[PDB]
Design a protein around this ligand. Structure first.
Ligand SMILES: O=C(O)[C@H]1O[C@@H](N2CCC(=C3c4ccc(Cl)cc4CCc4cc(O)cnc43)CC2)[C@H](O)[C@@H](O)[C@@H]1O
Ligand SMILES: O=C(O)[C@H]1O[C@@H](N2CCC(=C3c4ccc(Cl)cc4CCc4cc(O)cnc43)CC2)[C@H](O)[C@@H](O)[C@@H]1O
Lengths: 581, 581
């Protein structure tokens, strides 16, 4: 259970962000117990941010192993009466928190929050907070790291590591609000849709009165309820809608603690080959994104988030997929405010491939299902209340058509559907090569999400031949009667390369590629969404197939529009959110 | 008096940063008293950051007038016992702070901090904090804005406005440390240089004991002193040096309040035509920078700051000038940690130009000297203790060779030299066209800082002819016997444009331009520094002479190296910090 720490009349919030003491481990780092004394010959490193690109030389960018963040923490004794918590929004990949020298916390998982209590191990004056981060990836990590001293990522994006998201401190009374949940049953039958909202507060500590208050957009009060559980009757409810968002406020007063939560009233339901939002046939318009900026790397970047959402509404999009890892809490909340449809995805990327071993080989294969279940647990525990999240993605391009694959995902799908209070659709992004008959996603998933590159990796530069292929496979996928959407498709384009008679990597070819694909898409009424790959150019590991990173983005890494970006904006302008099919 | 709010055993610090409620004024904004009720139909805007580039359309970028930031503030009553302060690191240009509807603070000045007290006007639960920002510039603002409904900046950089730097909240006991000052008298006579440091603490409130403690780099204690004033004897003092920084810690315990301060022991003194740091002949290597990134605009950007300082040490630079406005506190402190020489400059840019009026015309001219004195007051009050600041710049390219000019600056120079506890050199950046005989900087300034463009605006593309000119004027400047340095010189280069036989705007020409200039520079021993313009490409107002902004940077706006960047790195590698002349 992880609530987003905010500022409230009952709780504080001190951002530990700034320039910390930084030092690359040299192997002897742990034996010599650097976490006690200061960082001798320390360096400077801003937090939050990925450290790989913040210094020159490959030895900082391509570091293998541990790095030590160090900082000076201090609290006034008049606050020790409250509950002190250290919240780490994200640490990529493996974090180990020390306080004066005592290991107080550990976490496996570089893209989800985790907190620890500081009341017992604090001191009186200056305390030495030491956060050690590991970047190693292997068959036991999500994302998955291969092998053939450097990390070999089994994924197509750079291994940005470090304190990726903010590290803050917040307080709370002894008996506090530890978690909250809210679902909505919307009565679309009446001429005006009314709504009934069910809540459930979980307290913790030496309990015992609980109060909840409902407010609207402006802040006007609307109703009140008592107890750890209750409901709200909203006649004339203002439904959260794609691109037309509306968020109510919820103020829960429990004992000596208060916490507010913005909630969006909307319904999500799959019906045959139709993805229904608020009981209407929705069509996905957008692209798979990355949390990738320069030189922040994977580090949080609120200004760029607002710019991207501006570029999106500029382009007439409505959705994106948190490609290959969960995004920041801030970006999720922003999509609630701005009304952006989001496909929340886990870190489960790279679960694929004297003898060739098999993905799900019990002895020499991925050892990730345990942690994979944790992520599904922690991901939903965090974003369960986000009205923008309309579906979960268990994994990106796994070996979903291989032996043991179905056995691997079935418990994960179940855990997901048993944990989502709203019981939202579940899916997995199908790598190219799978078919309706071979993909275990055909049975497990509510929506089929394809990653196809007809016209690039498969068929390019012959777009004519590539078209018949795309049509042949897409037509086959209709046999399932489920909703089909493309979550990835694009061609690497180096901004600035032009040609009248186009060739691969030019801006002209990139547009043609999306014209041919979109043409086929519109031929089938069970295609309920198109999301291009990628929103913008992003960094990867070096390779002959990567022209200074991934260049399949519609925009450059600095958000500048390629010619394709205008193409889509024109297309998506004449395509509505509902009723397209 | 403005101390940098940090985290201490006696004081808190809650970063109000995040996505605030935003709304462009429409004229009726103030009459309709938006600062009381919420922002109806509000928008999203991250803080801190310039808002001009965070939304699409010229109407947000080219807005004229007011914008309303709104936010929800809340404090627990158990903290009301302390002193509550709202610190605004920067608001560009004019800020007006409301709390529940009551105007509680105002400030003129978009690039320096200002705080206000919240104890008296707080409420119990949720408070509506409303920060209104104005972007208008005219003859009464610094920077100066001209005329011929839009702002016409009298300067060559875009008018990025909004909550440019962080807005935080910090507490402190009734009797607190309000200000601190530290100077150093270094005895360079002994074989080992010892040092004596003089401090001076200023308290405020219902007083009455004061304690100060000195620590070194690691954190080991070194000495102790009592009283609001005292000294420290440092035998074997570790002198802060350019590119070899060393900062001591200073822990002042006054009553129920503590505050720590990193200090760097170094001496600055001009001797004839020699700029002496720690009694050695220093040579400036660097460039004039901007606080300009995309899409942040002028907004703070700690990751880029660390990257720029990496690029600098990569390039073998040692100094930069806070071109045309004071930079963030974080960047100043970082230069102390990283050992970067800084020329702190004020916002006094644009003080230049049926009849042609004169700059300092008493009735129809710049009405800025009053505010100009404030900035000189507040700038030194903030950065007085930064061992990286080795000189002050009263103004950039003013009309320093016109009637009334000398009368305008003389009181400003005096106020500067009377306020700097360290009595550091003072100068002003001389626009092209001035000569040793005409520039009032010849008498007022300790160091001559020239902004010359021989080979671009003046002479280009004939670099041969441009050379004789540069030599003729530079030789003349030697008549003063003072130290001369170029704070600006460069040629607009569009990254990617190449030619064997170079032309203007190509990368080849840019290198040639700096070769010719640097050749002449090295012919004169009274030239003690070279700083190119600019560090990287930055945004300006649109114009036929601006190719999508200013492109004179050595690096692109995203910090990528142009061919010139490697040229300098090779040159600056064979040029030392001391003894070059
Ligand atoms: O096209 C992208 O590369 C982007 O789209 C997705 N991406 C899709 C392409 C991927 C493949 C792959 C898998 C099966 C077959 Cl038959 C062909 C190919 C192409 C070449 C190839 C070569 C390899 O060595 C490894 N993996 C592949 C999987 C990855 C990913 O989801 C995304 O991370 C990536 O950036
Ligand atoms: O070259 C830059 O433009 C950069 O260097 C500095 N910059 C120097 C060039 C500036 C001038 C100027 C002034 C006197 C004379 Cl004789 C010629 C010229 C050139 C053209 C010209 C045209 C105008 O309409 C107004 N101002 C000028 C002053 C400004 C500034 O300090 C910096 O802000 C700027 O970005």
């Amino acid at each position: 259970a992880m609530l987003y720490p905010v500022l409230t009349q009952s709780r504080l919030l001190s951002d530990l962000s700034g320039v910390w003491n930084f030092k690359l481990d040299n192997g002897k780092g742990f034996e010599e117990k650097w976490y006690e004394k200061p960082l001798k010959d320390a360096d400077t490193m801003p937090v939050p941010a990925s450290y790989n690109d913040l210094k020159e030389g490959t030895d900082f960018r391509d570091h293998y192993g541990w790095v030590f963040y160090q900082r000076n923490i201090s609290v006034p004794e008049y606050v020790k009466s409250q509950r002190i918590v250290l919240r780490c929004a994200a640490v990529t990949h493996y974090a180990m928190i020390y306080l004066n020298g005592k290991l107080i916390c550990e976490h496996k998982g570089g893209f989800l929050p985790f907190e620890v209590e500081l009341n017992d191990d604090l001191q009186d004056g200056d305390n030495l907070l030491t956060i050690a981060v590991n970047n190693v990836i292997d068959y036991t990590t999500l994302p998955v790291g291969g092998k053939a001293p450097q990390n070999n990522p089994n994924f197509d994006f750079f291994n940005y590591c470090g304190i990726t998201r903010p590290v803050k401190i917040y307080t709370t009374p002894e008996t506090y609000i530890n978690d909250i949940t809210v679902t909505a049953d919307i009565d679309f039958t009446k001429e005006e849709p009314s709504a009934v909202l069910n809540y459930n507060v979980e307290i913790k500590g030496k309990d015992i009165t609980c109060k909840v208050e409902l407010f609207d957009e402006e802040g006007t009060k609307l109703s009140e309820t008592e107890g750890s559980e209750g409901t709200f009757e909203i006649s004339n409810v203002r439904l959260w809608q794609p691109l037309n968002a509306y968020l109510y406020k919820i103020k829960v007063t429990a004992g000596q603690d208060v916490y507010t939560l913005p909630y969006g009233v909307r319904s999500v339901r799959v019906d045959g080959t139709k993805f229904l939002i608020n009981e209407k046939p929705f069509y996905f318009k957008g692209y798979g994104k990355h949390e990738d900026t320069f030189p922040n790397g994977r580090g949080i970047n609120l200004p760029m988030n607002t710019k991207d959402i501006s570029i999106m509404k500029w382009q007439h999009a409505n959705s994106f997929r948190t490609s290959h890892y969960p995004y920041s809490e801030e970006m999720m909340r922003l999509c609630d405010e701005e009304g952006i449809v989001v496909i929340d995805e886990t870190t489960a990327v790279g679960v694929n491939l004297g003898e060739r071993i098999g993905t799900f080989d019990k002895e020499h294969g991925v050892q990730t299902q345990e942690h994979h279940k944790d992520v599904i647990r922690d991901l939903i525990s965090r974003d369960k209340n986000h009205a923008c999240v309309v579906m979960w993605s268990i994994a990106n391009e796994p070996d979903s058509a291989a032996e043991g694959a179905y056995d691997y995902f079935k418990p994960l799908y179940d855990l997901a559907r048993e944990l989502d209070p709203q019981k939202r659709p579940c899916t997995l992004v199908s790598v190219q090569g799978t078919t309706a008959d071979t993909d275990c996603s055909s049975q497990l998933s509510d929506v089929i999400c394809l990653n196809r590159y007809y016209g690039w990796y498969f068929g390019g530069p012959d777009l004519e031949v590539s078209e018949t292929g795309l049509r042949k496979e897409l037509s086959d996928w209709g046999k399932l009667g489920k909703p089909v959407m493309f979550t990835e498709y694009g061609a690497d384009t180096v901004s600035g390369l032009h040609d009248t008679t186009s060739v691969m990597y030019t801006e002209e070819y990139q547009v043609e590629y999306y014209e041919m694909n979109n043409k086929v898409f519109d031929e089938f009424d069970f295609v309920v969404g198109e999301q291009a790959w990628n929103f913008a150019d992003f960094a990867t590991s070096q390779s002959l197939l990567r022209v200074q990173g991934n260049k399949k983005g519609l925009f450059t890494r600095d958000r500048k529009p390629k010619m394709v970006a205008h193409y889509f904006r024109n297309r998506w302008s004449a395509i509505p959110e509902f009723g397209y099919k």
